[PDB]
Amino acid sequence: KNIDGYFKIYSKHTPINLVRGLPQGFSALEPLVDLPIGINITRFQTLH
């Protein structure tokens, strides 16, 4: 997300057992990095 030009990045990594969809459970995401960039982003893509 973009908060006052500061990108706030949050991350969580846990093992799961999932056939498809999303599993039923609760988890919280820990802070990762904070990037003082301040550029407008209207779109995004993913790499594979």
């Binding site: 030009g5 500061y6 003082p36 301040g38």
Partner: protein, 49 residues
């Protein structure tokens, strides 16, 4: 018609006034971007009780 670039003669034998000086010019500009670079801080001792 003249070639604009000219050469600096550099030898140790030249006088002190004309000796080449390496000049480093720092450009200080305050924009609307978030400020990052700041002066050095100072850490003091920690006391309890």
């Amino acid at each position: 018609c003249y070639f604009p670039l000219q050469s600096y003669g550099f030898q140790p034998t030249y006088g002190v006034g004309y000796q080449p000086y390496r000049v480093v010019v720092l450009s200080f500009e305050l924009l609307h971007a978030p400020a990052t670079v700041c002066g050095p801080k100072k850490s003091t001792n920690l006391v309890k009780n």
